[PDB]
Amino acid sequence: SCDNCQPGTFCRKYNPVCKSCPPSTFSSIGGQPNCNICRVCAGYFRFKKFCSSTHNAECECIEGFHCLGPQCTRCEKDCRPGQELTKQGCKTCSLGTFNDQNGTGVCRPWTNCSLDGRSVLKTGTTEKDVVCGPLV
Numbered sequence: 131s132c133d134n135c136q137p138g139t140f141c142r143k144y145n146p147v148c149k150s151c152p153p154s155t156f157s158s159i160g161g162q163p164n165c166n167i168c169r170v171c172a173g174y175f176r177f178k179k180f181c182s183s184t185h186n187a188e189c190e191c192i193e194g195f196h197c198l199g200p201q202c203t204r205c206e207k208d209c210r211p212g213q214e215l216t217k218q219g220c221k222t223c224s225l226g227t228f229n230d231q232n233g234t235g236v237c238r239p240w241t242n243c244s245l246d247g248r249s250v251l252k253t254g255t256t257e258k259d260v261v262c263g264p265l266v
């Protein structure tokens with residue numbers, strides 16, 4: 131029977147032979163009637179894993195970008211200041227928080243001048259921390 135075939139092959143029900151998957155195709159399961167066409171990673175994408183007869187190629191994003199979604203279906207540009215990288219992609223810092231860093235970092239809460247026993251000299255932004263004053 132055609133079900134005794136190993137991975138990296140294709141096999142037909144009417145004439146059972148475990149013929150090797152040809153170049154730039156693959157099969158992970160076994161003795162299917164076809165091989166699947168190998169993925170290519172170009173443009174904004176790069177190869178994280180390459181294709182072989184047994185496994186598919188897997189993609190990365192280029193420098194300055196990052197994978198978005200389940201199986202890196204798209205690339206997103208790395209976050210600006212005032213944004214943070216989350217699972218749903220770059221998102222703006224919520225009120226009271228900030229991030230001054232470009233293409234990196236995490237939204238951290240504003241300095242609390244009352245907690246330090248000080249006055250507020252300048253107000254906070256999504257991209258800028260509060261500036262505190264003297265001690266009261």
Ligand SMILES: *[C@@H]1O[C@H](CO[C@@H]2O[C@@H](C)[C@@H](O)[C@@H](O)[C@@H]2O)[C@@H](O[C@@H]2O[C@H](CO)[C@@H](O[C@@H]3O[C@H](CO)[C@@H](O)[C@H](O)[C@@H]3O)[C@H](O)[C@H]2NC(C)=O)[C@H](O)[C@H]1NC(C)=O
Pocket residue numbers: 241242243244245
């Ligand atoms: C400076 O920080 C104080 C206290 O900060 C506390 O500790 C920090 C390390 C963080 O964990 C903070 O999340 C935490 O607040 C801030 O004062 C607090 O403000 C909150 C939000 O307005 C007050 O909550 C309210 O409390 C009343 C009852 O008192 C409720 O009815 C409201 O529904 C609401 O929950 C909270 O009372 C207050 N806490 C204290 C201990 O004072 C302050 O906002 C902050 N200042 C600045 C300028 O950012």
